[PDB]
Design a protein around this ligand. Structure first.
Ligand SMILES: [Cl-]
Ligand SMILES: [Cl-]
Ligand SMILES: [Cl-]
Ligand SMILES: [Cl-]
Ligand SMILES: [Cl-]
Ligand SMILES: [Cl-]
Ligand SMILES: [Cl-]
Ligand SMILES: [Cl-]
Ligand SMILES: [Cl-]
Ligand SMILES: [Cl-]
Ligand SMILES: [Cl-]
Ligand SMILES: [Cl-]
Lengths: 86, 84, 84, 84, 86, 84
């Protein structure tokens, strides 16, 4: 327990079939994820964000985020370093 | 690709890969079907700022209507919303 | 079927069709089972504005506790939350 | 000096130095006079999430009632609001 | 009383020395104002807005608004039809 | 001109025409002095999402710190914040 660090007004949350939790850390302009049982979060490599607000994850582990200040939606496949703008 | 969004807020994705977004600054809910580049507006009515969205295994879409203090839902292929 | 909501924000639906809403202006999380007609207030404690909600296949509820800079989880049969 | 705030949103200050805050997660508006050490909850009624606040030179308080799609006002010596 | 019309999740509010009330009608992508005693609002001619969130008015009646989805602040002088981007 | 803002939220203006903005997506409060094209960051500390801002006749700046459930203030030319 108490394993996310440095959160600031988290907004969106999603959970996948492995129990990994995805959060839009809305005050910090980033999307973080925490595997089940894990002590250390991962910060997803979305680029160019202006306040991520909502997040969803599909059955293939693709992460979709609303980029509130950029009027767009972005997506990252599981383990990818290269987002796609929807 | 989504076009003309304004301060999108909520996002959901169904078992087929369709993406649903609450276009929170534009008073509407939009989707983008997997297999398609054409966004569609869902026929919700009477909205005052849709804020969050969810989709169930049957394709039913559930939206928080922030300014009406209610949750609205549309079944897959229905144009008739139900209020929860 | 939901009652007394105030600027609901987040919404999630599980595989049973239970709908979960963050009743953001009232500092609480509510759920309504598919086919039920009374809501249940989930026994989260110490919230400062639940904002978003998700639910896993086992019915564990995850909520962003916006003003406490934290994510809380509650198993469906539990009255004791865990902080993530 | 403010107590029990939950995701405060709006803030205003008048010519007397009284500070007014929309205590947005608790569905209420609070004020603290310059040099005082207890807050007063303003007697607005029927709010669904006060979001923004302003105050005129006569001390009349204006609040956006986000979930009721309305603006409410309360004179400093009054217990009865007006809807704009 | 009950003189604003068509509001949708109003957010920001401001009041000037004439008692005119200014509101960001955040769900409708517009800024409205209502003079004291008046039965009919005015809609200010800001352009290109992506969700106005906050509003202020100065002692000269110049209106300043945060354009949340455009990552900017805009201003309109009293009676003007031509905003300035700050 | 303001530069590098992210989802600005609150705005205030003082008797001199200085404009104060809560740069809500960037965890900071900025101002732009009348007579100047150079924005400055106010030395608030410990912020978790500043949401609203007000300024009094003495130039004191008051900010709602949304994620810390508090209001912070800075006197004109002070770098030492006080918590209300
Ligand atoms: Cl928010
Ligand atoms: Cl936001
Ligand atoms: Cl928002
Ligand atoms: Cl909203
Ligand atoms: Cl909100
Ligand atoms: Cl919020
Ligand atoms: Cl908010
Ligand atoms: Cl709100
Ligand atoms: Cl909002
Ligand atoms: Cl907003
Ligand atoms: Cl916001
Ligand atoms: Cl916020």
């Amino acid at each position: 327990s108490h394993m996310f660090t440095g959160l600031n007004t988290p907004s969106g949350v999603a959970v996948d079939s492995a129990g990994t939790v995805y959060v839009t850390d809305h005050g910090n302009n980033r999307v973080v994820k925490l595997a089940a049982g894990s002590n250390t979060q991962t910060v997803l490599p979305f680029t160019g964000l202006n306040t991520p607000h909502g997040v969803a994850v599909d059955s293939a582990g693709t992460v979709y985020v609303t980029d509130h200040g950029n009027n767009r939606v972005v997506k990252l496949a599981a383990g990818s370093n290269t987002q796609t703008v929807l």
